[PDB]
Amino acid sequence: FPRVKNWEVGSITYDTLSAQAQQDGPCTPRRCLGSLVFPAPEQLLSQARDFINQYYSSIKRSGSQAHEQRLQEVEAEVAATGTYQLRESELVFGAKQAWRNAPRCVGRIQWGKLQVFDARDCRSAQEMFTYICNHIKYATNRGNLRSAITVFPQRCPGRGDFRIWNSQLVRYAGYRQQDGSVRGDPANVEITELCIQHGWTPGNGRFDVLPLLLQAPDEPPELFLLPPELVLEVPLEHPTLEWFAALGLRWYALPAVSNMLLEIGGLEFPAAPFSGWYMSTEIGTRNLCDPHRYNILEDVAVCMDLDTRTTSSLWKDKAAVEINVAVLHSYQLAKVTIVDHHAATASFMKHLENEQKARGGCPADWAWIVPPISGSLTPVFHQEMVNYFLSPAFRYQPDPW
Amino acid sequence: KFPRVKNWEVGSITYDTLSAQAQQDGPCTPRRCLGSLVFPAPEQLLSQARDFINQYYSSIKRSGSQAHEQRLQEVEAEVAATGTYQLRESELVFGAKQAWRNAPRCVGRIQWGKLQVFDARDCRSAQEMFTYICNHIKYATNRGNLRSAITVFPQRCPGRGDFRIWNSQLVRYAGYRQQDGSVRGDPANVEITELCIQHGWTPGNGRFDVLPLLLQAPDEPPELFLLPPELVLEVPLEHPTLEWFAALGLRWYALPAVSNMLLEIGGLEFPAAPFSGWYMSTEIGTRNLCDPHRYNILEDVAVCMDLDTRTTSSLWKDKAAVEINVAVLHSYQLAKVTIVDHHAATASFMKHLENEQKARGGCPADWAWIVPPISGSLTPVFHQEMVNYFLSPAFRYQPDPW
Numbered sequence: 065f066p067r068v069k070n071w072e073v074g075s076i077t078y079d080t081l082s083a084q085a086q087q088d089g090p091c092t093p094r095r096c097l098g099s100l101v102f103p104a105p106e107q108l109l110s111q112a113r114d115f116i117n118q119y120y121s122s123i124k125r126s127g128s129q130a131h132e133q134r135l136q137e138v139e140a141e142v143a144a145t146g147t148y149q150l151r152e153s154e155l156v157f158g159a160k161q162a163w164r165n166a167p168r169c170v171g172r173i174q175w176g177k178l179q180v181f182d183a184r185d186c187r188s189a190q191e192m193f194t195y196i197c198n199h200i201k202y203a204t205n206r207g208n209l210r211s212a213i214t215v216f217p218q219r220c221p222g223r224g225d226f227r228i229w230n231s232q233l234v235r236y237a238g239y240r241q242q243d244g245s246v247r248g249d250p251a252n253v254e255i256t257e258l259c260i261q262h263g264w265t266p267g268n269g270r271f272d273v274l275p276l277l278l279q280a281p282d283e284p285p286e287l288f289l290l291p292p293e294l295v296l297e298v299p300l301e302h303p304t305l306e307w308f309a310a311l312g313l314r315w316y317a318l319p320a321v322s323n324m325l326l327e328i329g330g331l332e333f334p335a336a337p338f339s340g341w342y343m344s345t346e347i348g349t350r351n352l353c354d355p356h357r358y359n360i361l362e363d364v365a366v367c368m369d370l371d372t373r374t375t376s377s378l379w380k381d382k383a384a385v386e387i388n389v390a391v392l393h394s395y396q397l398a399k400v401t402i403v404d405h406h407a408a409t410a411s412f413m414k415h416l417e418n419e420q421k422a423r424g425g426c427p428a429d430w431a432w433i434v435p436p437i438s439g440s441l442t443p444v445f446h447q448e449m450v451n452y453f454l455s456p457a458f459r460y461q462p463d464p465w
Numbered sequence: 466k467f468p469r470v471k472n473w474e475v476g477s478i479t480y481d482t483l484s485a486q487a488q489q490d491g492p493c494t495p496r497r498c499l500g501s502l503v504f505p506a507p508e509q510l511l512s513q514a515r516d517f518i519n520q521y522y523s524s525i526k527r528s529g530s531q532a533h534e535q536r537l538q539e540v541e542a543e544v545a546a547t548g549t550y551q552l553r554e555s556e557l558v559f560g561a562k563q564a565w566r567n568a569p570r571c572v573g574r575i576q577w578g579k580l581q582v583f584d585a586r587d588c589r590s591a592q593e594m595f596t597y598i599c600n601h602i603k604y605a606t607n608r609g610n611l612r613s614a615i616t617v618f619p620q621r622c623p624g625r626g627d628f629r630i631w632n633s634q635l636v637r638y639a640g641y642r643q644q645d646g647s648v649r650g651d652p653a654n655v656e657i658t659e660l661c662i663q664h665g666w667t668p669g670n671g672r673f674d675v676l677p678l679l680l681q682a683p684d685e686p687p688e689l690f691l692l693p694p695e696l697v698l699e700v701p702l703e704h705p706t707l708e709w710f711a712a713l714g715l716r717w718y719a720l721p722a723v724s725n726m727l728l729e730i731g732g733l734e735f736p737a738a739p740f741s742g743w744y745m746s747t748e749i750g751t752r753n754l755c756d757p758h759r760y761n762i763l764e765d766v767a768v769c770m771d772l773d774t775r776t777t778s779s780l781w782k783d784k785a786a787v788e789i790n791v792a793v794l795h796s797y798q799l800a801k802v803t804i805v806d807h808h809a810a811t812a813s814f815m816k817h818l819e820n821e822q823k824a825r826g827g828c829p830a831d832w833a834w835i836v837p838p839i840s841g842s843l844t845p846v847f848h849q850e851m852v853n854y855f856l857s858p859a860f861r862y863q864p865d866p867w
């Protein structure tokens with residue numbers, strides 16, 4: 065078992081949970097690839113039994129009659145149908161475990177608090193839209209954000225998957241210009257072009273909310289416009305720099321990831337969008353300041369009258385901090401849930417402590433957990449971490465086109 | 466067959482073919498990644514020596530020459546007769562530069578080809594170690610126009626103990642543990658401070674007392690040596706617009722000189738081989754001054770700046786850290802002591818990655834160490850995928866000699 069040290073406090077733990085790691089990662093004794101973003105009835109039954117055992121253990125009913133009965137039920141379904149169906153309680157447990165097991169999520173202190181919408185009876189893209197709107201309404205809750213996941217029907221043989229083509233439920237369009245530059249969000253140029261291909265009349269703003277492209281099994285994707293009253297946005301202002309508001313920057317309240325696959329007990333849900341609330345560096349540092357995103361850092365530095373002709377003035381650092389201040393100030397002013405990187409990382413340290421007692425460890429991806437500004441000012445920078453794959457899980461999956 | 470590596474800022478993709486030549490195992494397995502952990506015979510010696518001699522002759526474009534073959538034969542014969550072998554001076558220089566080039570945790574490797582190598586393999590005593598160390602410091606400091614240097618003491622050999630420098634760096638500030646558990650000075654150096662005291666050093670009582678050297682010659686107890694204060698260049702810290710900052714009485718030293726790592730070249734081990742370059746400002750301004758377990762000055766600075774330290778969302782920590790880093794850069798520049806900011810350094814490292822892709826087909830790099838401890842994603846290295854692996858010649862950690 066790996067020995068894991070916190071360098072701020074000098075405390076030591078052993079991650080015994082890593083010994084249970086299901087699937088293999090990208091590293092070998094010869095080289096580490098930890099910094100890379102994207103590195104049969106019999107097998108299904110094996111995963112299903114592992115999951116059922118896990119669940120019954122969690123509710124303190126291992127080797128109970130109910131446990132053995134459930135195992136028999138699953139064996140019978142698979143033998144008859146080649147697959148099986150989760151009880152609603154198992155779906156809820158599985159979704160929370162997948163969040164709990166996500167090594168790249170710093171917000172996992174909240175894992176036990178998740179609203180799970182069962183959309184496994186969904187039949188049409190039209191109904192997919194209704195479920196998505198209800199999710200957004202619930203999760204947004206007028207700015208008092210609540211964590212939620214909506215689970216669409218599982219993958220099955222001889223039927224296409226349900227898919228949400230958009231990477232998130234709310235995203236800003238990115239429009240390619242004649243010179244090769246982008247107006248709007250460069251991260252979304254591909255999905256923007258697909259929306260246009262499927263009949264969407266594009267705007268030409270910097271913050272146009274994208275329509276949804278929803279795919280019901282074996283159908284071409286269908287285009288749906290989100291009602292603007294459903295999409296809560298926050299205009300950005302700064303508490304002391306009066307000109308900041310004039311920049312016309314804004315962002316949306318609800319981070320709702322919609323392109324990942326949920327795996328539970330060998331079953332796969334290719335459409336299962338989930339949402340929480342934002343950590344401020346996601347917006348202020350990554351979305352607005354990344355050179356391949358909105359890339360506004362230098363615009364802000366010009367407005368602050370910073371010396372941008374020498375790196376050693378640390379103009380980039382100063383401009384970035386004020387942008388993060390503006391995000392935090394603006395979300396709080398607008399009464400929309402947001403957490404700063406210091407509070408989030410402190411809660412994650414608490415989570416690590418909880419998980420050490422509960423499970424003997426916690427899979428975590430250091431490069432993703434440490435915030436993109438002020439890294440070593442947060443306690444997570446000083447914490448050694450072990451990264452491994454546990455199931456239930458959220459997995460990346462190929463784009464449906 | 467080879468790891469595919471993407472840069473996310475630019476969208477460019479390369480394959481790290483050099484990784485396939487990795488010479489030792491790291492700590493990761495397909496089951497779990499330990500990349501974030503800080504500290505995770507004749508036939509073998511001959512294989513390592515032949516590989517190194519081959520690297521050398523390739524480096525000078527004389528692969529296959531009569532000189533190349535003669536050296537291979539000579540080394541194999543020497544190992545057979547003596548159990549070990551000796552490097553030629555030119556091989557030592559090449560080997561030290563390669564070890565720097567190979568160091569996955571160093572962001573300053575654009576400079577790898579410019580290294581002054583002092584050959585101290587003739588050293589016979591701790592007194593003589595001290596002479597070599599003093600000369601290294603004087604040369605490398607160069608009145609503030611810093612020059613990268615390494616001094617190589619005699620290699621490990623059977624029948625004889627090692628030369629060792631007990632100190633973790635040539636210049637370090639004492640850390641004096643107080644009764645209540647607190648530390649006056651640098652908490653990172655409490656152990657070496659206590660050992661100096663155990664070995665006859667009369668301690669000071671300041672926050673910035675330069676430690677003496679504990680130098681160990683083979684099969685001898687360590688001996689204590691005081692550095693002439695005129696030899697240790699220091700920089701008082703002030704801030705260009707926060708006038709009270711100077712009154713904190715902070716200072717740092719010019720020369721970062723790591724002295725506790727082992728240099729490995731062609732199977733030969735040099736347990737004493739201190740090296741020095743120049744500082745990147747975040748090492749001082751962010752880590753040394755702001756780590757909670759180091760000087761820990763962040764809150765006091767923030768309060769003097771009149772920041773709201775009552776809630777985290779004002780980002781008082783971030784604002785104060787940036788100004789401390791500004792003070793470090795301003796002060797070193799004012800004192801005319803070489804220093805590099807994290808933006809300039811990471812940009813130069815990206816150039817180094819490019820050079821190395823063409824030259825060797827890859828570059829071993831430890832992402833967690835390369836990305837600076839403030840403003841990570843504002844630097845290009847944050848967006849660059851990296852492959853971490855071990856090549857030799859190398860600088861390696863080694864157990865403390867006590």
Ligand code: HEM
Pocket residue numbers: 159163166168169170171172174178211212213324338339340341342343346403408432458
């Ligand atoms: C409740 C407040 C939450 C906070 C503050 C939070 C925070 C974060 C942050 C900062 C990231 C890094 C994202 C990035 O850099 O792109 C992340 C990733 C992630 N989160 Fe959480 N999160 C929350 C809720 C959730 C929920 C409800 C789920 C699932 C049920 C979840 C699952 C994940 C997954 C799978 C990732 C990895 C995404 C990827 O690989 O691109 N998170 N989270």
Ligand code: HEM
Pocket residue numbers: 561565568570571572573574576580613614615723726740741742743744745748805810834860
């Ligand atoms: C010339 C200017 C140089 C700069 C700007 C530079 C920069 C850095 C930085 C910022 C680190 C991280 C240190 C830490 O966080 O503790 C580092 C580590 C390292 N550097 Fe360089 N360096 C320079 C010269 C050198 C030289 C001359 C050598 C050897 C000949 C070297 C070899 C190493 C090694 C082996 C490490 C790893 C240290 C450890 O693991 O504790 N560097 N360097």
Ligand SMILES: C[C@H](O)[C@H](O)[C@H]1CNc2nc(N)[nH]c(=O)c2N1
Pocket residue numbers: 099100101431432433473847848849850851
């Ligand atoms: C190359 C590197 O792995 C990549 O830039 C990562 C670094 N850490 C990250 N961390 C988070 N939270 N989100 C990210 O998108 C990234 N990007």
Ligand SMILES: C[C@H](O)[C@H](O)[C@H]1CNc2nc(N)[nH]c(=O)c2N1
Pocket residue numbers: 071445446447448449501502503833834835
């Ligand atoms: C636990 C973690 O590996 C540790 O804090 C590392 C992170 N990255 C680092 N990076 C550098 N350059 N120097 C360090 O000391 C560290 N410390």
Ligand SMILES: NC(=[NH2+])NCCC[C@H](N)C(=O)O
Pocket residue numbers: 171232319320321339340341342343346347350351
């Ligand atoms: N806090 C979250 N749940 N984040 C999910 C990822 C959101 C993504 N980083 C974004 O900036 O939109």
Ligand SMILES: NC(=[NH2+])NCCC[C@H](N)C(=O)O
Pocket residue numbers: 573634721722723741742743744745748749752753
């Ligand atoms: N730039 C260097 N060569 N650094 C070597 C390590 C110095 C160490 N980080 C310090 O703060 O003293």
Ligand SMILES: [Gd]
Pocket residue numbers: none
């Ligand atoms: Gd102006």
Ligand SMILES: [Gd]
Pocket residue numbers: 706707708
């Ligand atoms: Gd002032």
Ligand SMILES: [Zn+2]
Pocket residue numbers: 091095096097098493497498499500
């Ligand atoms: Zn790894």
